[PDB]
Amino acid sequence: GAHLARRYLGDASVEPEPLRMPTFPPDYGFPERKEREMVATQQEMNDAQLVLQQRDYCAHYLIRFLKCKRDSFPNFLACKHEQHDWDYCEHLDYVKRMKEFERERRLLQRKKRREQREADMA
Amino acid sequence: AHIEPRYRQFPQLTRSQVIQAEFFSATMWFWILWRFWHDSDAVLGHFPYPDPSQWTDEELGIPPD
Amino acid sequence: MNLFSSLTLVTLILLTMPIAAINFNTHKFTNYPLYVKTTISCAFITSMIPTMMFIHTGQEMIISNWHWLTIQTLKLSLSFKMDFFSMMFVPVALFVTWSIMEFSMWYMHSDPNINQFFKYLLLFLITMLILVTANNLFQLFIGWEGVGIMSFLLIGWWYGRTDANTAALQAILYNRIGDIGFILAMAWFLINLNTWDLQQIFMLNPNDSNLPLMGLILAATGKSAQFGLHPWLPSAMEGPTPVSALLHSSTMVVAGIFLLIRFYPLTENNKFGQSIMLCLGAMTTLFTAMCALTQNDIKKIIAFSTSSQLGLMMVTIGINQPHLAFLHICTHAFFKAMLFMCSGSIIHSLNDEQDIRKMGGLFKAMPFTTTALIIGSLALTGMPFLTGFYSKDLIIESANTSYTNAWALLMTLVATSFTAIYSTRIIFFALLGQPRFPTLININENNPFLINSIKRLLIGSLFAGFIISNNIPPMTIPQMTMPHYLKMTALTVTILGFILALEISNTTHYLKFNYPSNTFKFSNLLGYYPTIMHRLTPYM
Amino acid sequence: ITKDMLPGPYPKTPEERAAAAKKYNMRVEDYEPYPDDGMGYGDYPKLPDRSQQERDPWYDWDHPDLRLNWGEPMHWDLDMYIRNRVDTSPTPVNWNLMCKHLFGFVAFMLFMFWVGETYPTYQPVGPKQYPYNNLYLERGGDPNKEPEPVVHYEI
Amino acid sequence: SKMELPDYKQWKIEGTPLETVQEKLAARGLRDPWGRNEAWRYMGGFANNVSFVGALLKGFKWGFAAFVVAVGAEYYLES
Amino acid sequence: DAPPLTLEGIKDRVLYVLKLYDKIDPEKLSVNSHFMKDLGLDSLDQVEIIMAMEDEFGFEIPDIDAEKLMCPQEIVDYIADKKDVYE
Amino acid sequence: SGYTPDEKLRLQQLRELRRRWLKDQELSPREPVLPPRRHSIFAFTHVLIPVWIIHYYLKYHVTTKPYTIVEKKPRIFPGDTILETGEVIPPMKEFPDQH
Amino acid sequence: AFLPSAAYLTHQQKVLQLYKRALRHLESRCVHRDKYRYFACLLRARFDEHKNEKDMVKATQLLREAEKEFWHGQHPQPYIFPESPGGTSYERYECYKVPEWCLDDWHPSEKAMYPDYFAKREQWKKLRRESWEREVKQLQEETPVGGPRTEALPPARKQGDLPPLWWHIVTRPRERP
Amino acid sequence: SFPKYEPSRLASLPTTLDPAEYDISSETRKAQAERLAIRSRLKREYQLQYNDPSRRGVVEDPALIRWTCARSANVYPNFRPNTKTSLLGALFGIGPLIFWYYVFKTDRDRKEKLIQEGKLDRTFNISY
Ligand SMILES: CCCCCCCCCCCCCCCCCC(=O)OC[C@H](COP(=O)([O-])OCC[N+](C)(C)C)OC(=O)CCCCCCCCCCCCCCCCC
Ligand SMILES: CCCCCCCCCCCCCCCCCC(=O)OC[C@H](COP(=O)(O)OCCN)OC(=O)CCCCCCCCCCCCCCCCC
Ligand SMILES: *C(=O)CCCCCCCCCCCCC
């Protein structure tokens, strides 16, 4: 929660805004960056009736977990490993979002140092 | 026999109400310690929270210029 | 198909059958309350089968069984909606109601109008299951006005008392001020979407939906006792204790929260409605839980407790997490009905004594009531792996980790501390300390009605959060990666509330007389809000 | 009942005032009528505008729910000063201090909600990224058209 | 029908906080007349009430024993 | 709940309160024992005796009846009048 | 002081009349004179007969009408076998493993 | 202030009422029994410190500042007994306190269910209606001219006569009907 | 020293802090005796007819009949045209009518201007 004080009580020019970001190109700093690979087919989740919040890049573990939760009835506690797989993949997606935020912070620090060296030179 | 009311002192206790109350207190503590044993993560945390300052510039793609 | 909808309608027709029994009588009944308790037991067992075959697949349907009225483009059919909300609220409401009525066979045993009491309580149950199985706004308005009218009739149960009729008419006034907004919402949906059916409302997906959501928020403010329109719920403890236990803890007062949960596809596309709900809910859960810190009537304290929890529900609707709010309803029902039942057992044991300043010594004097009220207070505060852990803490885990009003989050955490403060206030003045009640101890709790009625909700308050939270399908993605000071927020602030209020409680045994300042006089007089608006606005 | 006990016009002469005080069953010196402006009160007494809560609750009343006696001249708003309605009872805190505290608490809390809405709290993360052109067909996009490609990248 | 009352001479305030009240009144020269009427609230089976941490931890011993026995059972059963 | 009190029981409870009181000797206390004239008590002590009755039986006596109960027989008679005993 | 002896004698006489009234409120052992007037029947008359009536009404009058009982279609997973068509749904791709 | 028998509270009665309401608000401030017991002896000693004061104007002055002390040290919600007015259980059973005269309007087939009760009630009615004119003529000569000055009713005087205005006091409903 | 209780119309001054309770003058004695006399006389005249066994009906209160005849039957003959009553009959009689008239006319002129221009969202509006 340091970023709240760094955006409110410090300066706002270097902390990235939540609403409009990424403000940079995807390959600005990335040579041969690969695209995300989708595992679940679109019709497979159109037939899985998933919530549109849940139709992200990791809903295949959720499809496996729901097939488990249906099939293992009445033993409602026999699907902990599918749940932990899906939670671990959500954890990795959250870590990727943190990497997006930290990439934006370091590029704004890069822009700050760039404009300060341009002002001190010219 | 019912519980006759007493005067200025501790009333008569049925054995059954006391043993059921102690049984549900022990059931509460058994369930709390059982689920704290098996889960231990809905209270403490499920996954380790990383540190964004320790990340290198190569994995985030920051060429130093 | 043939089993689900059949047992769905069999539950409702089975609830309507003792109304025909009490209306088609000549003789004096061989314990008609036992008949209604057996009937609601059977309706719970009947409603559990569609719940199990919803846990298995997720089978939702609609019973549009009786075409009632066609106003030129509006086909008002008798339409029931069996989705997740009906399937998880109907057995909880039936279980709580069956426990309340087996409590009521003992608490209202000396009443010569016990048949009218159980008739009114079953009419309330019928209207609430009209309210939560409704598929159009007209049938939902039937259930809405039905729980309002049974609120009137069950607050004014001892009608010779002037304050009971006063509180009933007050409750009617605040609920009709909510009805202004609900009829505003019905008017907007009929003029702009040509429907009251929820399906066409969700399908047409309006973008300029500020006015109908403000109408629904005003309806919930009237019904769920949010800020601006709260004081009828502290006044509504004037009626009988099973009335304040069934209706005003677990069944009626969640209807505005249930209305805003039912309209989640409209609130999830509007940041303005989410912001209004978040601000108003944080305001309510601050103010009512603060007013609970200085009361001595125990039913007032638990009324401010349940209104603070409704404000927390309004917060977690305002963060666009509706299923967590609904799980907090279905969790809150068990232990809050049980806390009112244990408070009523303390009241009935101490010869109609509701004031905690004349209680005490009830740790071993009422051991089953002591055990159950301690378990209820712990499940209120969010003790780990009791039922109140399986929603409320998760609320905090999504109230921190979202694009949120920060002051609303901070007031939610202050309210979370205040819950622990008044919970240990209840435990300290009621169960702890020394006897302060009169000298002829007629303390008794040895009725199988009372034991079984608190026992089933105690099994609920130990297991139902785990069981329901593991039987749902995931309708959201749970936020499960967060820093350790932010994961441990609600538990730490709850324990800080425990310790600070143990300091507050240990100040009472000091032999020092202090003049009360503006804080105690502010909160003890109900934040000064029922004083002015009940004297100044009806005068003008 | 007859004519000379019903309410009549406003009294002018003091012997009419004395006859009306005998009529309204009260003392002449405590008999005070409403101000003669034409609002239609007549000779009716200005009772001191206290509600029925401040009347003696232990006293053997003729009407115990209203706390009132037989023949005593009722207040003009006796239907209004009932114990179901507006009271006149004193509070331990003054009225003006209650107005100040309630208005100040409401205004300060709503102002802090506005400040916190201006300054939101959030998480150090980016936006939730969605496949298939940021869920174009799932959000209701028409199949005859093709959107711009919304492609996300590994990190 | 006829309910018998206990003795009125057994309710003396030695051992109660009424003794501390009477000592603080005697230290300034006053006397408490109503000690024996308040004597029953602090004596008998209403003496030595638990603390709040003693109230929360009701039934902790048998719950801890059931925890240890059942975890031993599931640890000896999983092999 | 709320057991049916009798005049013998109410009398024994009133004299049991007043024999727990340090300004009343338990061998001189009778049913006709006036407080200002047979026990020599203060009016403040009479107020505290009525307040002890109020804390005993669980109801409040108004001051217009509290200022006039000057012996335990009148106290038992007033509790009988306000409780309807010997039905 | 206490009461005047007029008040004491009045409360004495009123109390005597009140206690005679309350004593006369007791009943005789023959009062009230009343006028001269199946173990699982509850599961039969309140469950089975309403299940019969409601299933008959839903089957032969409600489902015979269009869109009255509209059932949500069941959730299809990769790995299902359809009872109507007979085609087994092809499963998902091998996962880009993470642990 | 407002009394049935008398027309004013005396200075002694004002001191008693202020002392009793002061201890009730004190016990509202002093929840625990021993702490209230100590402060109740302190308040008793403070009322005893100005007991033997002979100047009535100085006593009225001290009673005035005592009312200011009472108003300054009061509790917002004092403890109220349940059957006492303002309590939670006050006038609760007034919906069950049916008056007696409706017993005069039953059907005979529901009066025949309780034969002895109405056969015993008829002599109460006979005693009332043959006592009424005697107690009326007892009132009209014992009340002074100009109405009765106070609300106190006289008792009976003759051995065989009932007190005046007695019926609805004796036949008033019970506290638990 | 101590805060004074300041009165209110909705929260009046108590019995204790009012100075006219602590006056011991002779006219207060005589006024209390006169009020006691009238109250005792009316109490006696009430509870004679209340306990009267010949009367099976309603003890009429002349005060209650007087109040009901005051609230309805003394309205018009004691109405006089002056400044205060006519300005309140204009301020409270036709004032809010003018207010709601111009508000509703402004709103419907705005809505009809938006509709005849084709600018109001009236897509699924076919019930009216
Ligand atoms: C308890 C006794 C029951 C009967 C027992 C003995 C009979 C044997 C048992 C089986 C039952 C009888 C045979 C099946 C029933 C008849 C079937 C049939 O054709 O029915 C014709 C119709 C079906 O409707 P319909 O659509 O065919 O006809 C309506 C007519 N038009 C189209 C012109 C509008 O009627 C019924 O089925 C009526 C059933 C009503 C059940 C619910 C009543 C609720 C009342 C609420 C009033 C207010 C509502 C307001 C809100 C409404 C929503 C917005
Ligand atoms: C999302 C937005 C949310 C916005 C929230 C804020 C908006 C609402 C603001 C507050 C409005 C309600 C409060 C003001 C009126 C309250 C009236 C009331 O409840 O009175 C209670 C009173 C008795 O209560 P009490 O004295 O406390 O009881 C103790 C027992 N003797 O009972 C009485 O005295 C009886 C009174 C009878 C006569 C009443 C006459 C006035 C009626 C007023 C109706 C108000 C209509 C508002 C319309 C709004 C339209 C949008
Ligand atoms: C960074 O610190 C921002 C985190 C979110 C806003 C502040 C939350 C403060 C309260 C949570 C921690 C409480 C620990 C007792």
Coordinates of C-alpha atoms in Angstrom, one line a residue, chain F:
Chain F
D1 CA -42.1 -18.7 35.5
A2 CA -43.4 -15.9 37.8
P3 CA -44.5 -18.1 40.8
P4 CA -47.8 -17.3 42.6
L5 CA -46.8 -15.4 45.7
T6 CA -48.7 -15.7 49.0
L7 CA -49.1 -13.2 51.8
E8 CA -47.0 -15.5 54.1
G9 CA -44.3 -15.6 51.5
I10 CA -44.4 -11.9 50.7
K11 CA -44.3 -11.2 54.5
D12 CA -41.4 -13.5 55.0
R13 CA -39.5 -11.9 52.1
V14 CA -40.1 -8.4 53.4
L15 CA -39.0 -9.3 56.9
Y16 CA -36.1 -11.2 55.3
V17 CA -34.9 -8.0 53.6
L18 CA -35.4 -5.9 56.7
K19 CA -33.5 -8.4 58.9
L20 CA -30.6 -8.1 56.5
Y21 CA -30.5 -4.4 57.3
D22 CA -28.0 -3.1 59.9
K23 CA -30.3 -0.5 61.5
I24 CA -33.0 -3.1 62.4
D25 CA -32.5 -5.6 65.2
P26 CA -34.2 -8.9 64.1
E27 CA -35.8 -9.6 67.5
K28 CA -37.6 -6.3 67.7
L29 CA -38.9 -6.3 64.1
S30 CA -42.6 -7.3 63.8
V31 CA -45.4 -6.8 61.3
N32 CA -46.7 -3.7 63.1
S33 CA -43.2 -2.3 63.7
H34 CA -43.4 1.3 62.6
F35 CA -40.2 2.7 61.2
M36 CA -40.1 6.2 62.6
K37 CA -42.0 5.3 65.9
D38 CA -41.0 1.7 66.7
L39 CA -37.5 1.6 65.1
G40 CA -36.7 5.3 65.2
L41 CA -35.6 5.4 61.6
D42 CA -34.8 8.4 59.4
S43 CA -36.9 9.4 56.4
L44 CA -33.9 8.7 54.2
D45 CA -33.8 5.2 55.7
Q46 CA -37.5 4.8 54.8
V47 CA -36.7 5.8 51.2
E48 CA -33.9 3.2 51.2
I49 CA -36.2 0.6 52.6
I50 CA -38.8 1.2 49.9
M51 CA -36.0 1.1 47.3
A52 CA -34.8 -2.2 48.7
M53 CA -38.4 -3.5 48.3
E54 CA -38.3 -2.3 44.7
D55 CA -34.9 -4.0 44.0
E56 CA -36.4 -7.1 45.8
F57 CA -39.7 -7.7 44.1
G58 CA -38.9 -6.3 40.6
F59 CA -41.3 -3.3 40.3
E60 CA -41.3 0.3 41.2
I61 CA -43.6 1.9 43.8
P62 CA -44.5 5.5 43.0
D63 CA -43.4 8.3 45.4
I64 CA -47.1 9.1 46.3
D65 CA -47.2 5.6 47.7
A66 CA -43.6 5.3 48.8
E67 CA -43.9 8.3 51.1
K68 CA -46.8 6.6 53.0
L69 CA -45.6 3.0 53.6
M70 CA -44.4 3.3 57.3
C71 CA -44.6 -0.3 58.5
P72 CA -44.0 -3.7 56.8
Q73 CA -47.7 -4.6 57.1
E74 CA -48.6 -1.8 54.8
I75 CA -45.7 -2.9 52.5
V76 CA -47.1 -6.4 52.3
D77 CA -50.6 -5.0 51.8
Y78 CA -49.5 -2.7 49.0
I79 CA -47.6 -5.6 47.2
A80 CA -50.8 -7.6 47.7
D81 CA -52.8 -4.8 46.1
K82 CA -50.4 -4.5 43.2
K83 CA -49.9 -8.3 42.7
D84 CA -53.4 -9.8 43.3
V85 CA -52.5 -12.5 45.7
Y86 CA -54.8 -15.0 47.4
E87 CA -56.9 -15.6 44.3

